[PDB]
């Protein structure tokens, strides 16, 4: 008869119960305790300036209308019943398009205690906005936020709090990181207030701090450009009479630099300013351009002033590697230490 | 106190008819609109549309929802929206739109004692606007959003902007990676269809494209290849293989640039400014290789005339290329 007793209590709780009214309406502010478990910090898209995250969202509040007495002290509830009671209308301020999973059934859970406390958990995938400053690309670091609050209830009606200390209220799984190109350093948890045309609302915020991995750009951009510059300065050691050899050499290292520069921009988003890679490529391009101008000068002065042409080639064999090594030292000390 | 509210609300919704507009059969119901733009992104030239996220609020008075005895504004659960009458507002140029539904449907209903209803929604919409790209990338665009009632006419419903020019907020905080919003405008008018008149509100933005990306990614490589094609003039004319290889490989590089631009840019079958610049550079390197064709053809019988042609080409080509740049930039900036 335990099942019939429980059924009676279930069929008695919701008698005279209106789910269109929050608990304590007109009497007190509804206090909501929230915590987040991150199961996977998904891919980050630099093109769209957005990121994906999979979370368990846990909310807890008190509803005196749902007190009961029975053999048990905790009740686990089917998701059909969790839609009969009032729940907070929490939404993510910076969300773009989120998915609530219901395979094979809705991934929601609602537990009721005897004193009237309700625990409401759900599984969500959130695609959020992470605006980025790419002036230091690909040696940049970003703070991707996640903000949430009540869509309809002002802070005079509903307020949010973290279940524990804010540091310990957002927990990330050990295998959570699903980042091919970023390194998740940590997160900071805060809470503020926003004002809209409809009122003032409480906002709960979390910031995830990311630092970009640079090895891909090293193997895709920096190494081919360095090899092309070294080849163009290798051109200085061929004899002057080999005119077609040095002309093909210079013009093909210039076309290779042009191809690399055009190739690099595809990864980059369409930004107005110039990244650190734009400057590195522009300097390598200017180096191979000056090496071909140098050969044009040597060929112009050959057969009339061979002494001057030899002096120019001898000084270029020293000046170009020195200036390029100094530029690399400055470049990789200005940006790697930020 | 909560039981009295439950009684009053159930009293109001008892006998309420959703199929009838407020003041049905009498004076038209006036609806005020507010838009709070949250973000604008993905302005697509290929798809010829843009994506907009906003908070859309509607205010109207319904005498059937007036209550007394409670000195409060009642914000109700958004599922009560299915039990009330709401305007049949729609966007005429919307290709795809949806209401956010995490963790619940992003909808709001608020009631006031005099019977005024506030109805809010959080909407992401993709709106189509035609782009005239004859001056691309030095072009300005004007993209709009049209708000209209699907079924009612001006004898039933009326639209106005709530707050005048302050009805739309959040434009000043928008940052676009490629564009910059110059101005926004609000227009109210009626549209005379075959079924009668229809109230309409319009919100338009004017966009001015940024140039730094095209300067550092498109025009500079073509300029540098054009300047490098002039290196041939300082090489001796008997180096036939070097000058031929330089001319035709610079032609091939310019062709590769144009082809890949054709692969990435939107298929817009008319002449733009970028096509004029790329074609002008291609003409300059084509004529530089035809000049070496002439020099190679005459450097044996008349080596002095071929040397004088190369020397004069060292002056004529940079001067005519700077004159071309001056004319191009004056006509487009």
């Amino acid at each position, epitope marked *: 008869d335990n099942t019939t007793v429980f059924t009676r209590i279930l069929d008695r709780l919701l008698d005279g119960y209106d789910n269109r009214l929050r608990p304590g309406l007109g009497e007190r502010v509804t206090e909501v305790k929230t915590d987040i478990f991150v199961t996977s910090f998904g891919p980050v898209s630099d093109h769209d300036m957005e990121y994906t995250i999979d979370v368990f969202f846990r909310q807890s509040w008190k509803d005196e209308r749902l007190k009961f007495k029975g053999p048990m002290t905790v009740l686990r509830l089917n998701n059909l019943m969790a839609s009969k009671i009032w729940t907070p209308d929490t939404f993510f*301020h*910076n969300g773009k398009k989120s998915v609530a999973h219901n395979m094979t059934m809705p991934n929601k859970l609602l537990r009721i205690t005897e004193d009237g406390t309700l625990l409401y958990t759900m599984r969500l995938t959130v695609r959020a906005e992470c*605006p980025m*400053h790419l002036e230091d690309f690909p040696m940049d*670091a*970003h*703070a991707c*936020p996640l*903000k949430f609050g009540s869509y309809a209830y002002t802070r005079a009606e509903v307020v949010y709090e973290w279940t524990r200390e804010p540091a310990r209220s957002v927990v990330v799984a050990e295998d959570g990181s699903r980042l091919n190109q970023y390194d998740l*350093l*940590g997160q*900071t948890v*805060d809470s*503020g*207030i*926003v*004002q809209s045309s409809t009122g003032e609302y409480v*906002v709960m*915020t979390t*910031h995830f*701090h990311l630092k970009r991995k640079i090895g891909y750009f090293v193997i895709q951009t920096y190494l081919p450009c360095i090899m092309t510059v070294i080849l163009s300065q290798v051109s200085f050691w061929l004899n002057r009479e080999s005119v077609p050899a040095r002309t093909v050499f210079g013009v093909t290292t210039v076309l290779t630099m042009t191809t690399l520069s055009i190739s690099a921009r595809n990864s980059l988003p369409k930004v107005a300013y110039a990244t650190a890679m734009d400057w590195f490529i522009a300097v390598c391009y200017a180096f191979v351009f000056s090496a071909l101008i140098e050969f044009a000068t040597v060929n112009y002065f050959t057969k009339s002033q061979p002494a001057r042409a030899a002096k120019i080639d001898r000084l270029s064999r020293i000046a170009f590697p020195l200036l390029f090594g100094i530029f690399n030292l400055v470049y990789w000390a200005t940006y790697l230490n930020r | 106190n909560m039981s009295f509210v439950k009684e009053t609300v159930d009293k109001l919704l008892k006998g309420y008819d959703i199929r009838l507009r407020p003041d049905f059969g009498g004076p038209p119901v006036c609806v005020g609109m507010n838009i709070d733009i949250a973000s604008i992104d993905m302005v697509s030239e290929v798809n010829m549309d843009y994506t907009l996220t906003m908070y859309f609020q509607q205010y109207w008075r319904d005498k059937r929802l007036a209550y007394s005895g409670i000195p409060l504004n009642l914000t109700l659960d958004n599922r009560v929206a299915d039990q009330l009458w709401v305007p049949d507002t729609y966007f005429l140029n919307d290709k795809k739109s949806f209401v956010h539904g995490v963790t619940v449907k992003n909808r709001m209903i608020r009631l006031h004692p005099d019977g005024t209803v506030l109805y809010g929604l959080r909407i992401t919409t993709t709106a189509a606007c035609m782009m005239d790209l004859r001056r691309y990338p030095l072009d300005e665009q004007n993209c709009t959003l049209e708000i209209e009632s699907y079924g009612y006419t001006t004898d039933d419903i009326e639209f106005y902007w709530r707050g005048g020019d302050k009805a739309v907020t959040g434009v*000043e*905080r*928008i*940052e676009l990676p490629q564009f910059s919003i110059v101005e926004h405008r609000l227009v109210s008018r009626n549209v005379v269809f075959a079924t009668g008149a229809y109230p309409r509100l319009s919100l338009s933005f004017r966009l001015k494209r940024n140039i730094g990306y095209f300067i550092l990614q498109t025009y500079m490589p073509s300029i540098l290849i054009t300047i490098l094609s002039w290196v041939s003039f300082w090489i001796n004319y008997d180096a036939s293989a070097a000058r031929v290889a330089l001319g035709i490989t610079t032609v091939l590089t310019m062709t590769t640039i144009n082809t890949h631009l054709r692969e990435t840019l939107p298929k817009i079958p008319y002449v733009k400014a970028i096509d004029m610049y790329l074609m002008g550079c291609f003409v300059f390197v084509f004529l530089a290789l035809l000049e070496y064709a002439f020099v190679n053809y005459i450097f044996f019988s008349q080596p002095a005339r071929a040397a004088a042609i190369d020397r004069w080409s060292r002056i004529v080509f940079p001067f005519t290329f700077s004159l071309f740049n001056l004319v191009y930039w004056l006509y487009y900036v």
Partner: nanobody
Amino acid sequence: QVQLQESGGGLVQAGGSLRVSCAASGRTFTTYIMAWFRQAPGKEREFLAAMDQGRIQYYGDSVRGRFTISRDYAKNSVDLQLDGLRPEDTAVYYCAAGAGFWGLRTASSYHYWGQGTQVTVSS
């Protein structure tokens, strides 16, 4: 160059309103977090308030309910309304802008800083 120029400040008689402003130049900070800090004489630099791109307002646990922050995004500026001032509020108020990496409440995460503005409270 980029400069954060600050105005306002001065002295007040243990109360009244005091709106300290901050105007930016040389760079648009629409996508940045603009904040206010406070440095009492010789003690330490203290976080006061901050506002991000989404108009979310953050406040220190000592000035909540007394100081109000705001931003004029069109003019690229930020203001701080000081109300119910106390003698303990006599310090040098700073204006900062940053991306909030590793924390928006820490002073070591802001790229640009103002020249300061003395606020004196007399009782």
